[PDB]
JSON list of N, CA and C in Angstrom, two decimals:
[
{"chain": "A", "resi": 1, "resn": "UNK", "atom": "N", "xyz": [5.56, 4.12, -0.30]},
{"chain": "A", "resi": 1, "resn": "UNK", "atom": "CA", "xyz": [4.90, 5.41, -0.20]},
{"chain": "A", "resi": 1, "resn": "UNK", "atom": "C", "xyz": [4.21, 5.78, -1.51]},
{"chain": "A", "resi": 2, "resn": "UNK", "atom": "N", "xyz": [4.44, 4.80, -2.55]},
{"chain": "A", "resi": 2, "resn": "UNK", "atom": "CA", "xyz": [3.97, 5.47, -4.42]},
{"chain": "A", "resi": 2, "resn": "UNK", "atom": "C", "xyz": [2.70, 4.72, -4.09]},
{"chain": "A", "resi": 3, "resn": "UNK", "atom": "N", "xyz": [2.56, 3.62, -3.18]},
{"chain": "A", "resi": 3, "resn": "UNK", "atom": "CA", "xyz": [0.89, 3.30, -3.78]},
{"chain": "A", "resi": 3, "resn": "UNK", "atom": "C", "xyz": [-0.02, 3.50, -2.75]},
{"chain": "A", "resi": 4, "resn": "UNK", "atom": "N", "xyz": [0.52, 4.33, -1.47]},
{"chain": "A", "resi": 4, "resn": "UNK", "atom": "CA", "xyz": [-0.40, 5.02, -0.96]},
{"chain": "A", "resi": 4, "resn": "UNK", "atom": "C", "xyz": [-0.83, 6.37, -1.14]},
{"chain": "A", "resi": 5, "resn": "UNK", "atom": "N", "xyz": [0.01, 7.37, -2.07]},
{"chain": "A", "resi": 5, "resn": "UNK", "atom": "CA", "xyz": [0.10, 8.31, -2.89]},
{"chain": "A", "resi": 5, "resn": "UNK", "atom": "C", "xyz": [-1.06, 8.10, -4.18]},
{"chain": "A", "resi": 6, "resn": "UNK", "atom": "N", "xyz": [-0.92, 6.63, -4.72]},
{"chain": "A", "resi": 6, "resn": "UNK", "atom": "CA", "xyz": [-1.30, 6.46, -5.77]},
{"chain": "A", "resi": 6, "resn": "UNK", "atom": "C", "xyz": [-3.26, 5.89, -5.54]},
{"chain": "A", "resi": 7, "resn": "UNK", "atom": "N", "xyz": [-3.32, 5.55, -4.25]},
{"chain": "A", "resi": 7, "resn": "UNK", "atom": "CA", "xyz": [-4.69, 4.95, -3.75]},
{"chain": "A", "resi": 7, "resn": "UNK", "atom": "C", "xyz": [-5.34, 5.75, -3.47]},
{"chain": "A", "resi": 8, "resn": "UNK", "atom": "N", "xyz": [-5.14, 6.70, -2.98]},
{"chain": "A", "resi": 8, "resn": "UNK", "atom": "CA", "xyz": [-6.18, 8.65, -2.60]},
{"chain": "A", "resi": 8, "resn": "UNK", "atom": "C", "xyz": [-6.27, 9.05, -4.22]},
{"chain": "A", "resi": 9, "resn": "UNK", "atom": "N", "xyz": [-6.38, 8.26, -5.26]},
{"chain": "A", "resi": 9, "resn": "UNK", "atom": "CA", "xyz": [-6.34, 8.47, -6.72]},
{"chain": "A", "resi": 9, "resn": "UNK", "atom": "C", "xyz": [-5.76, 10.02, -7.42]},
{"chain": "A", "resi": 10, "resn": "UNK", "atom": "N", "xyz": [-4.46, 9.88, -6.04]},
{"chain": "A", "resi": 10, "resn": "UNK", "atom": "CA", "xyz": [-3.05, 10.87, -7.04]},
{"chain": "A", "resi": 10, "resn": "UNK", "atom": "C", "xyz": [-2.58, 10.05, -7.73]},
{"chain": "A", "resi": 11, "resn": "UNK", "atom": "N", "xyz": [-3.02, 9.78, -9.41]},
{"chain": "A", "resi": 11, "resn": "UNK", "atom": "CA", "xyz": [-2.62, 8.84, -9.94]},
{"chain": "A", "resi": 11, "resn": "UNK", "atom": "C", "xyz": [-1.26, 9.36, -10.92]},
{"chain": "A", "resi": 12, "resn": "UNK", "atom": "N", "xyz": [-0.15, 8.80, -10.77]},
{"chain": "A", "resi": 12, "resn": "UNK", "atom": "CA", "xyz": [0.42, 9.46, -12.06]},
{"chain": "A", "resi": 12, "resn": "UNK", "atom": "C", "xyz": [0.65, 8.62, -13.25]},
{"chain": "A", "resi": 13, "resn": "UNK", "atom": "N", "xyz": [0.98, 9.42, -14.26]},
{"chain": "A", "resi": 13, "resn": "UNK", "atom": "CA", "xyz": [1.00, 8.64, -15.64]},
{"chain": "A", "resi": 13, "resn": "UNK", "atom": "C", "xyz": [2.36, 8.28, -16.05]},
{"chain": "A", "resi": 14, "resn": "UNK", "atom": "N", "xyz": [2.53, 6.78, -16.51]},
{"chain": "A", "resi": 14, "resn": "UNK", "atom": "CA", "xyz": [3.75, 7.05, -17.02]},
{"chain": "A", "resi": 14, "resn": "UNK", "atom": "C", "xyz": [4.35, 7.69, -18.47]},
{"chain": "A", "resi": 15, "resn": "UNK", "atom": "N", "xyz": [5.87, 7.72, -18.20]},
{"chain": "A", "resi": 15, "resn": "UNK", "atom": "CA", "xyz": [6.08, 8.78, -19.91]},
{"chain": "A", "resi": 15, "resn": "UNK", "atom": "C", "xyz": [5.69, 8.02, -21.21]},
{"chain": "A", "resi": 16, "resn": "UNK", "atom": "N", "xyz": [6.04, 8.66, -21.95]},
{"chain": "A", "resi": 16, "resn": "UNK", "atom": "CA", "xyz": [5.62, 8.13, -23.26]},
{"chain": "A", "resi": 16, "resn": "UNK", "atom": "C", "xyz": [6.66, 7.02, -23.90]},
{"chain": "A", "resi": 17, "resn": "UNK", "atom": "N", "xyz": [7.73, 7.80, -23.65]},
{"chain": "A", "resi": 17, "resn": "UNK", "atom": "CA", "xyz": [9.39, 7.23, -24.19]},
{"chain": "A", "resi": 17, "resn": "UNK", "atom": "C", "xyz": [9.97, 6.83, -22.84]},
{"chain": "A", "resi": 18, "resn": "UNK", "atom": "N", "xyz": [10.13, 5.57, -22.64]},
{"chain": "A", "resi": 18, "resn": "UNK", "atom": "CA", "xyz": [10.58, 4.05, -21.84]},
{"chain": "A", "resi": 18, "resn": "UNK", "atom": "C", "xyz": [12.17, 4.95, -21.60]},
{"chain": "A", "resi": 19, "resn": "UNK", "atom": "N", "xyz": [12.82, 4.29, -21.10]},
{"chain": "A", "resi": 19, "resn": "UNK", "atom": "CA", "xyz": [14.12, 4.71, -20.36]},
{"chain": "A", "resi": 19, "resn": "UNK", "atom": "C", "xyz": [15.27, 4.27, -21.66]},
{"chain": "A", "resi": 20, "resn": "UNK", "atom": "N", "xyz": [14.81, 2.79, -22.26]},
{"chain": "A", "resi": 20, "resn": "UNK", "atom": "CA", "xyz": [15.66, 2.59, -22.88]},
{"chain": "A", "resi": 20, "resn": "UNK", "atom": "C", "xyz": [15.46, 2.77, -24.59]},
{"chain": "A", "resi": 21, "resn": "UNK", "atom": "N", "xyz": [14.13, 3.32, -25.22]},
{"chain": "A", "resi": 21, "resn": "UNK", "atom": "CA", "xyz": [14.86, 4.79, -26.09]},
{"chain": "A", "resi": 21, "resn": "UNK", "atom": "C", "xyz": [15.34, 5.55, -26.34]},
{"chain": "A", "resi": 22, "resn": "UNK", "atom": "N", "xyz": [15.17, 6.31, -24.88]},
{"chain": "A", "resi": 22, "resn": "UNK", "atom": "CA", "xyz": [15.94, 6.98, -24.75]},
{"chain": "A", "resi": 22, "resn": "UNK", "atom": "C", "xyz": [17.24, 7.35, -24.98]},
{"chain": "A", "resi": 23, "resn": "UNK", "atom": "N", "xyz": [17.86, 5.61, -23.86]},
{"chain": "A", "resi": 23, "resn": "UNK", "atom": "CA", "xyz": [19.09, 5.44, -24.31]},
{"chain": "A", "resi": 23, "resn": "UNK", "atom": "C", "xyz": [19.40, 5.06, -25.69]},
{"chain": "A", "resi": 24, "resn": "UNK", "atom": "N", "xyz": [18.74, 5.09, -26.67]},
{"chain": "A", "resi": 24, "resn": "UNK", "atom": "CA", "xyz": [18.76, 4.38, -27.77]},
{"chain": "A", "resi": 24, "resn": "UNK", "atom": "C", "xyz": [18.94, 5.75, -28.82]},
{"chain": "A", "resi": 25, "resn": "UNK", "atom": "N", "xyz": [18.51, 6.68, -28.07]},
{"chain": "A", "resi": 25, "resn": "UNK", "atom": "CA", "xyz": [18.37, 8.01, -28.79]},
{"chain": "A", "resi": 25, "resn": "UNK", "atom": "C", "xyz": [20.04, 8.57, -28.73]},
{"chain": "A", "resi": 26, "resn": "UNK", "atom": "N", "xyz": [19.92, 8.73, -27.08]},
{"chain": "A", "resi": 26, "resn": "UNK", "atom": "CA", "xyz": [21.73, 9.17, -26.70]},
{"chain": "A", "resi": 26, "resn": "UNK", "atom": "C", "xyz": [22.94, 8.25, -27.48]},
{"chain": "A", "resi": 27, "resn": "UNK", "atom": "N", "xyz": [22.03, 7.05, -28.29]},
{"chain": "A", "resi": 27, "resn": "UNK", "atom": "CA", "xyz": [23.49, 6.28, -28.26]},
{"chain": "A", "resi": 27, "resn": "UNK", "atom": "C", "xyz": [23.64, 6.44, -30.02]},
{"chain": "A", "resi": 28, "resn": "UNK", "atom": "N", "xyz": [22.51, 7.25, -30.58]},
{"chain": "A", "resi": 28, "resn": "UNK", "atom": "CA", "xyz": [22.32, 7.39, -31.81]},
{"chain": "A", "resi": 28, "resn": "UNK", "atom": "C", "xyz": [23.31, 8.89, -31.73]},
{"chain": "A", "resi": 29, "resn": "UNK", "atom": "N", "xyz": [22.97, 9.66, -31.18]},
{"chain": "A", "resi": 29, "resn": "UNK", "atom": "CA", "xyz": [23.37, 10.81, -31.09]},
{"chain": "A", "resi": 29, "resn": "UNK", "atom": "C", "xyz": [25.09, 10.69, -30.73]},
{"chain": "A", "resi": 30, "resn": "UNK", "atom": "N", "xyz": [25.56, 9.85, -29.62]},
{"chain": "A", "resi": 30, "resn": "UNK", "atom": "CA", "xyz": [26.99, 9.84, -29.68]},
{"chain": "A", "resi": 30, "resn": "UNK", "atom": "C", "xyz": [27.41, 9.12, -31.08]},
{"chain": "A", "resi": 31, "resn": "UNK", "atom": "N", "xyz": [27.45, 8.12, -31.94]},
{"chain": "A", "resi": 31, "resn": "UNK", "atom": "CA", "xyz": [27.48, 7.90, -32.99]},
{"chain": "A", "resi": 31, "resn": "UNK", "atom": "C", "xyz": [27.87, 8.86, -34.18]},
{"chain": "A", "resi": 32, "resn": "UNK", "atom": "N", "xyz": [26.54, 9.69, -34.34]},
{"chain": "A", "resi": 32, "resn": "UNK", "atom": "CA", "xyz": [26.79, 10.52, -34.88]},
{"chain": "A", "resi": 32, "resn": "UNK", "atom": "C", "xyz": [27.77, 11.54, -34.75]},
{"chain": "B", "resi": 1, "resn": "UNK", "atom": "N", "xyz": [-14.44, -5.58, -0.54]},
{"chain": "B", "resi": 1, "resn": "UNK", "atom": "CA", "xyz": [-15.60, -5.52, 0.36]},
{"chain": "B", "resi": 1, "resn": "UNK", "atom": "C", "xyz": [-15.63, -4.65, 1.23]},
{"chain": "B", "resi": 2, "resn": "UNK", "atom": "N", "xyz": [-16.79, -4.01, 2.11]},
{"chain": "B", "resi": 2, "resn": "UNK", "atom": "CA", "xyz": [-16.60, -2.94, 2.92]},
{"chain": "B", "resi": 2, "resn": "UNK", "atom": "C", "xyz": [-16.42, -3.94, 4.45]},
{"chain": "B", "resi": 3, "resn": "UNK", "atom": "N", "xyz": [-16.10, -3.05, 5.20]},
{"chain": "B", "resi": 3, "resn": "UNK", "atom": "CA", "xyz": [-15.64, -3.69, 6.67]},
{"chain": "B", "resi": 3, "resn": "UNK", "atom": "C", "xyz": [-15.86, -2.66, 7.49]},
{"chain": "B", "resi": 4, "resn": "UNK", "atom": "N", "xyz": [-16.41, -3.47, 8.63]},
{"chain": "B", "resi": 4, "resn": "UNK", "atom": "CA", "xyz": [-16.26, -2.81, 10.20]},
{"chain": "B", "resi": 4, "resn": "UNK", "atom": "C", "xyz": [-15.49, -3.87, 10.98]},
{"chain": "B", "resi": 5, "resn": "UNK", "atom": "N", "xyz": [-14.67, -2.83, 11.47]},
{"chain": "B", "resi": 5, "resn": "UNK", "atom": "CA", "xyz": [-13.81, -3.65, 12.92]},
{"chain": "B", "resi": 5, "resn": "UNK", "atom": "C", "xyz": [-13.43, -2.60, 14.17]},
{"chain": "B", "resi": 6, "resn": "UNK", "atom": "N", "xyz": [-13.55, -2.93, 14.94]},
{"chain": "B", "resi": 6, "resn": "UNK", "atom": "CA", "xyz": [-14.14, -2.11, 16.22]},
{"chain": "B", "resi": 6, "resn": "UNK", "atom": "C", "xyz": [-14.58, -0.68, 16.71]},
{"chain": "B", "resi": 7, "resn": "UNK", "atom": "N", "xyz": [-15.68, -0.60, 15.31]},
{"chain": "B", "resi": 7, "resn": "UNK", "atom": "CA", "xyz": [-16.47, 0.30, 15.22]},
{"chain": "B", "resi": 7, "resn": "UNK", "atom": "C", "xyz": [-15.92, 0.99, 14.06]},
{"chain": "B", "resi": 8, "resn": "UNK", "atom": "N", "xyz": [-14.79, 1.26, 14.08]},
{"chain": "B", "resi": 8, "resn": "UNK", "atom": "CA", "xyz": [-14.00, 2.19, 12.41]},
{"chain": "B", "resi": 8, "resn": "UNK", "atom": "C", "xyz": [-14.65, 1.27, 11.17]},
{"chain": "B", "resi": 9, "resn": "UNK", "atom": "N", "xyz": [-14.89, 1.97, 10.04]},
{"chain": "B", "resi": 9, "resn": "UNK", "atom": "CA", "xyz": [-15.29, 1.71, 8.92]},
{"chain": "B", "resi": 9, "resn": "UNK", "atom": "C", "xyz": [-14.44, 1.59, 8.10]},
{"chain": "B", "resi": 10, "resn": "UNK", "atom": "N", "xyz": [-14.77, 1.05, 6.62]},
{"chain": "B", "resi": 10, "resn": "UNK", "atom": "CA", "xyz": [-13.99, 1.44, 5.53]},
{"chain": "B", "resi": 10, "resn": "UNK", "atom": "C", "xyz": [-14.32, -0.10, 4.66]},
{"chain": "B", "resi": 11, "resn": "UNK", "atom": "N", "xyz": [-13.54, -0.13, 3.87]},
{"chain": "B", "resi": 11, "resn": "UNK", "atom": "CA", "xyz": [-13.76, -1.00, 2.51]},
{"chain": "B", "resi": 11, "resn": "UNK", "atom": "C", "xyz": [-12.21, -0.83, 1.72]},
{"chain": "B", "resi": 12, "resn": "UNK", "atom": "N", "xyz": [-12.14, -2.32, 1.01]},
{"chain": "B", "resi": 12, "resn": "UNK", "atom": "CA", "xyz": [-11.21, -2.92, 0.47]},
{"chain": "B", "resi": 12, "resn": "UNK", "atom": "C", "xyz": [-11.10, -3.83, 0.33]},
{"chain": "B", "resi": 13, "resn": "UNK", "atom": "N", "xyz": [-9.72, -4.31, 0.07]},
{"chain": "B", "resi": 13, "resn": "UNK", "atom": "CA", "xyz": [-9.77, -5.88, 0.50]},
{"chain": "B", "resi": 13, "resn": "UNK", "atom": "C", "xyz": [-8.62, -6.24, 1.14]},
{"chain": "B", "resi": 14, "resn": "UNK", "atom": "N", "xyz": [-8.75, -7.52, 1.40]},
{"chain": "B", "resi": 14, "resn": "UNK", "atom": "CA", "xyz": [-8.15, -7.91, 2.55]},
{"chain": "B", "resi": 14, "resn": "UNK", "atom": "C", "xyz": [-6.98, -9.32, 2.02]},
{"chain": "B", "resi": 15, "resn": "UNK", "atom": "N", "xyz": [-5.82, -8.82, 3.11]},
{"chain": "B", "resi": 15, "resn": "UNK", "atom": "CA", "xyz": [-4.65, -9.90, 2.64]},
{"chain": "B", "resi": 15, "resn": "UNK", "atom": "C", "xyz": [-4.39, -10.24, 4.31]},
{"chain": "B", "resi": 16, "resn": "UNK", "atom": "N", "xyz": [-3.78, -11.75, 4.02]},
{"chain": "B", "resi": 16, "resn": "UNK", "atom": "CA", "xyz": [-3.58, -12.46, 5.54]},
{"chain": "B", "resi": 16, "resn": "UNK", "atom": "C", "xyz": [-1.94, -11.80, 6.38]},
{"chain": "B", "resi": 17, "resn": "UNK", "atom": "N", "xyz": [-2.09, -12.25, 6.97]},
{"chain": "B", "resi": 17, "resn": "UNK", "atom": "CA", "xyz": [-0.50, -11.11, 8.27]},
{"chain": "B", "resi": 17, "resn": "UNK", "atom": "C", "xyz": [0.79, -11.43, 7.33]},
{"chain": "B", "resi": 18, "resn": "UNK", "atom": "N", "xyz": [1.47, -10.44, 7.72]},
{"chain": "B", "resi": 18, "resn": "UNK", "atom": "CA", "xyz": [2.82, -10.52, 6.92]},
{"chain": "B", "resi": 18, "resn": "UNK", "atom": "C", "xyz": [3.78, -9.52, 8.35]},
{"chain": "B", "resi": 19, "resn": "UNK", "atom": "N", "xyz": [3.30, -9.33, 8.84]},
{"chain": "B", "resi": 19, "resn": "UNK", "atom": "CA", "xyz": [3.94, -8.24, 9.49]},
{"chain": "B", "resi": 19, "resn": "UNK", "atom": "C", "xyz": [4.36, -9.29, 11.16]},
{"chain": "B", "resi": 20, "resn": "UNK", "atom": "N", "xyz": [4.79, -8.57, 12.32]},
{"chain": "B", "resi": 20, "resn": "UNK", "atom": "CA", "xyz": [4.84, -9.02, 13.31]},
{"chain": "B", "resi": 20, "resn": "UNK", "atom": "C", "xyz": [3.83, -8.51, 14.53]},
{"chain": "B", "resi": 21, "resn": "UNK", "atom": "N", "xyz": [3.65, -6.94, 14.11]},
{"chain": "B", "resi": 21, "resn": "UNK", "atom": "CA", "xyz": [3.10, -6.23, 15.78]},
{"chain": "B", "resi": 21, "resn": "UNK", "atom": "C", "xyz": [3.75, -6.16, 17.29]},
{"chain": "B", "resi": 22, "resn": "UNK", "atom": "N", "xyz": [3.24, -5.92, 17.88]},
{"chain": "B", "resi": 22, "resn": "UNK", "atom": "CA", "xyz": [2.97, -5.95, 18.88]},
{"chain": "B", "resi": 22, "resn": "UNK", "atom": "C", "xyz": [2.15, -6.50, 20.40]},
{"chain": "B", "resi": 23, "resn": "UNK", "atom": "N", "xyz": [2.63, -7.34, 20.98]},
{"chain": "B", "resi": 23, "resn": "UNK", "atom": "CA", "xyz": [1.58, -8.34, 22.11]},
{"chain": "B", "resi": 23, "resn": "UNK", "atom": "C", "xyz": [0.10, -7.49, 22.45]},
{"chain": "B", "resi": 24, "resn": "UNK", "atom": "N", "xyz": [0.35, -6.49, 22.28]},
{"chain": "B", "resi": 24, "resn": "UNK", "atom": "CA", "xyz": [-0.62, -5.72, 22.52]},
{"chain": "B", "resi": 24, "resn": "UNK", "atom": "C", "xyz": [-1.58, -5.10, 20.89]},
{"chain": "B", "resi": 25, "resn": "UNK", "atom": "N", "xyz": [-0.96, -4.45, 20.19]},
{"chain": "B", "resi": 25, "resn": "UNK", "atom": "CA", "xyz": [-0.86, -3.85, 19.31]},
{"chain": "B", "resi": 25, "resn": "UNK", "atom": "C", "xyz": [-2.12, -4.47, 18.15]},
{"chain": "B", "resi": 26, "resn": "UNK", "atom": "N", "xyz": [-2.94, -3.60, 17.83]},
{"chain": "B", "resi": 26, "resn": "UNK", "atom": "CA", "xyz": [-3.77, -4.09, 16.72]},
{"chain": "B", "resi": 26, "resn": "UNK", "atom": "C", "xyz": [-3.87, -3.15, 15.74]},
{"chain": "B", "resi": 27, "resn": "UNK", "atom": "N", "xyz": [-3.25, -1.85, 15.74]},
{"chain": "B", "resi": 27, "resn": "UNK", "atom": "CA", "xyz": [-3.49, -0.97, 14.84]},
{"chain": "B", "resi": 27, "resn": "UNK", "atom": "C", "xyz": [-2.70, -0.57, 13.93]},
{"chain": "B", "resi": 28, "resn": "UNK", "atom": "N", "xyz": [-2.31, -0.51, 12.71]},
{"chain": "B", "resi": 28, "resn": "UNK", "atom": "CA", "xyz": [-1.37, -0.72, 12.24]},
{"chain": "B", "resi": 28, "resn": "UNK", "atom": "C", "xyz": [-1.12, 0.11, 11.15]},
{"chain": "B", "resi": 29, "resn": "UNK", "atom": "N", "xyz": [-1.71, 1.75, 11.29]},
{"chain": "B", "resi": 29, "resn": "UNK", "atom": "CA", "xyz": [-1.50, 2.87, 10.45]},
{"chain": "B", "resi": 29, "resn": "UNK", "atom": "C", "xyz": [0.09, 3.73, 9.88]},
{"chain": "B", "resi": 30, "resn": "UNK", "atom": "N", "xyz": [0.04, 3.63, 8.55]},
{"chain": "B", "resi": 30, "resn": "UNK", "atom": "CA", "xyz": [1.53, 3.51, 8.20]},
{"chain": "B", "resi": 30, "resn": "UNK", "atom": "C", "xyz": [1.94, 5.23, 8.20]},
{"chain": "B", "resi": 31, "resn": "UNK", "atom": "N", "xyz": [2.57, 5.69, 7.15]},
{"chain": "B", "resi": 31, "resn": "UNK", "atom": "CA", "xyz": [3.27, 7.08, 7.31]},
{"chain": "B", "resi": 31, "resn": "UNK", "atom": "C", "xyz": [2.02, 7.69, 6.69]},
{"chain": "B", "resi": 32, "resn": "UNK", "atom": "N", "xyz": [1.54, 7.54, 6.24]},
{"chain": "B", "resi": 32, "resn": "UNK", "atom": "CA", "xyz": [0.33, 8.36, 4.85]},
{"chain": "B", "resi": 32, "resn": "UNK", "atom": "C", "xyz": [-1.09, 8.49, 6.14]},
{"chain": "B", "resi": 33, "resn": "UNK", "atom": "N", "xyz": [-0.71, 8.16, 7.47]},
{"chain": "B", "resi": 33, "resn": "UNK", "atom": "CA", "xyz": [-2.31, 7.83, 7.98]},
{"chain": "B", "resi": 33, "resn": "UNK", "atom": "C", "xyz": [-3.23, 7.43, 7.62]},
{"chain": "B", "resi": 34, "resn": "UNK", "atom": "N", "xyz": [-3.01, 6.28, 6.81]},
{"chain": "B", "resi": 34, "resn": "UNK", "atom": "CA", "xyz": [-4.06, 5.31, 6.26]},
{"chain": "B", "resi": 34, "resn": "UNK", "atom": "C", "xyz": [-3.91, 3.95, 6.52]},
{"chain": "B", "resi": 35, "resn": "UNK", "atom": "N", "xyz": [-5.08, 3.30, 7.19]},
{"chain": "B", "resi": 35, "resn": "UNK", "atom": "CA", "xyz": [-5.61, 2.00, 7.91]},
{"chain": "B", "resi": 35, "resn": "UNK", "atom": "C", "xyz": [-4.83, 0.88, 7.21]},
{"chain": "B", "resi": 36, "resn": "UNK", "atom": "N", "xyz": [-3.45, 0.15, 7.53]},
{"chain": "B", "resi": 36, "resn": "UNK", "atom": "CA", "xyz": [-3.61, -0.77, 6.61]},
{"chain": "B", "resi": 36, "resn": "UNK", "atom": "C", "xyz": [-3.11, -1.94, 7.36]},
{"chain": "B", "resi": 37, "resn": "UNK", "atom": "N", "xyz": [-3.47, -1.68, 8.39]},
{"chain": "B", "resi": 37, "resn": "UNK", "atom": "CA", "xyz": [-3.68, -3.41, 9.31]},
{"chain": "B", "resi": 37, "resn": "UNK", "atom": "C", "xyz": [-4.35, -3.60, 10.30]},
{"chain": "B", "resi": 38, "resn": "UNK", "atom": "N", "xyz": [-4.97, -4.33, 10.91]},
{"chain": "B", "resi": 38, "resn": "UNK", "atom": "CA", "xyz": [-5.95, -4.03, 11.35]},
{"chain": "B", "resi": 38, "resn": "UNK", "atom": "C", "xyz": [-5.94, -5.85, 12.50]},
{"chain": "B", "resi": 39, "resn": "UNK", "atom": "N", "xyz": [-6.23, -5.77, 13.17]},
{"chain": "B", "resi": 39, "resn": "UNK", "atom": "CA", "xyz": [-6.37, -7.08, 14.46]},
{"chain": "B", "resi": 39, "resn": "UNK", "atom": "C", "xyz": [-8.19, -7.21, 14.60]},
{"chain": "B", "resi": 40, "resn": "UNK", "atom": "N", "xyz": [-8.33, -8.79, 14.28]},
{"chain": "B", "resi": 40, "resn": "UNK", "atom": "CA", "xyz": [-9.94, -9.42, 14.81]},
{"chain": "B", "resi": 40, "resn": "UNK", "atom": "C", "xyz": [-9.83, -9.35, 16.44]},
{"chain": "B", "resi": 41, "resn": "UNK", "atom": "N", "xyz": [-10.71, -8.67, 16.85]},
{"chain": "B", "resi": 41, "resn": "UNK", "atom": "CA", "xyz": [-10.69, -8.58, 18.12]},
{"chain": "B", "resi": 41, "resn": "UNK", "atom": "C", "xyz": [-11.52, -9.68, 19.07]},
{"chain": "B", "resi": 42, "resn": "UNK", "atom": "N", "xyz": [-11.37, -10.98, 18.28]},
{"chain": "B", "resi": 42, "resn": "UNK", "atom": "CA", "xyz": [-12.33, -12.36, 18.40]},
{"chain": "B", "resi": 42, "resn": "UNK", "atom": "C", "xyz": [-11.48, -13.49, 18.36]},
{"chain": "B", "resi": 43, "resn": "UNK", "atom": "N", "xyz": [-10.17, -13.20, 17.50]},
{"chain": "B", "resi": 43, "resn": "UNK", "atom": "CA", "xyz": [-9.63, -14.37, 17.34]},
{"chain": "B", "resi": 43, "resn": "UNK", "atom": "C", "xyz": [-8.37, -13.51, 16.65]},
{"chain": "B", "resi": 44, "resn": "UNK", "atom": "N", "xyz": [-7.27, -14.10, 17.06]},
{"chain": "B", "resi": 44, "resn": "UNK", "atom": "CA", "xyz": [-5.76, -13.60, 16.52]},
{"chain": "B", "resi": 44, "resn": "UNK", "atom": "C", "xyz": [-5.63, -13.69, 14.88]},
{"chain": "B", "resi": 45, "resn": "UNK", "atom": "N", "xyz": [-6.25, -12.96, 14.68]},
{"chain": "B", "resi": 45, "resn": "UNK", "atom": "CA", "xyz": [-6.18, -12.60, 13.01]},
{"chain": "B", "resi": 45, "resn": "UNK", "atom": "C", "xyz": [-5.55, -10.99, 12.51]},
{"chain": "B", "resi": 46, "resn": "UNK", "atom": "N", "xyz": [-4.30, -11.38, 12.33]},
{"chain": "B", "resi": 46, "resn": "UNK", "atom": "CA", "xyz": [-4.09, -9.77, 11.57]},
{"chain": "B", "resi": 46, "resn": "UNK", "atom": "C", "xyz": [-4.26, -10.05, 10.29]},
{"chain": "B", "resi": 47, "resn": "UNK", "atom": "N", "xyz": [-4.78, -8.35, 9.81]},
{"chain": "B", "resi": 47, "resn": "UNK", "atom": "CA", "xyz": [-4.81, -8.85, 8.30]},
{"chain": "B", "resi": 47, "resn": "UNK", "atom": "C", "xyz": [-4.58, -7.53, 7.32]},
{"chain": "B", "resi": 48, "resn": "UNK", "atom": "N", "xyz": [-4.28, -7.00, 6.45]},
{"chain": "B", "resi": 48, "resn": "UNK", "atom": "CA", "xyz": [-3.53, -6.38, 5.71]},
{"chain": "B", "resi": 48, "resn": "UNK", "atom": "C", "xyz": [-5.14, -5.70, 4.92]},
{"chain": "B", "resi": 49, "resn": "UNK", "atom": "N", "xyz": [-5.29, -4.17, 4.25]},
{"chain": "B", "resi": 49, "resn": "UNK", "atom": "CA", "xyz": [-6.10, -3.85, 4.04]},
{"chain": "B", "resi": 49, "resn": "UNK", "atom": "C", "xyz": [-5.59, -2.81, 3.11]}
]
């Protein structure tokens, strides 16, 4: 259903920060 | 490329059958109501669009 959504050029963008910075962020933050 | 097939229009491109159908069946519009299979009405060709 995302790339017939995505072919009527409802295009979406992806984020900036990947999934696993993220986690890279949370795992900085439990650390601390 | 653009395409006509039995009289409906449109443009894209085209991939060979993956699907099964129907003995009858040539039309092959999914949940979004948009064309994306389509039967040669000349020769048993489905084809993906």
């Amino acid at each position: 259903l995302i790339c017939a959504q995505k072919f009527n050029g409802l295009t979406v963008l992806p984020p900036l920060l990947t999934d696993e910075m993220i986690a890279q962020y949370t795992s900085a933050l439990l650390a601390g | 490329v653009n395409f006509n097939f039995n009289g409906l229009t449109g443009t894209g491109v085209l991939t060979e059958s993956n699907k099964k159908f129907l003995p009858f069946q040539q039309f092959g519009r999914d949940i979004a109501d948009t064309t994306d299979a389509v039967r040669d009405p000349q020769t048993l060709e489905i084809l993906d669009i």
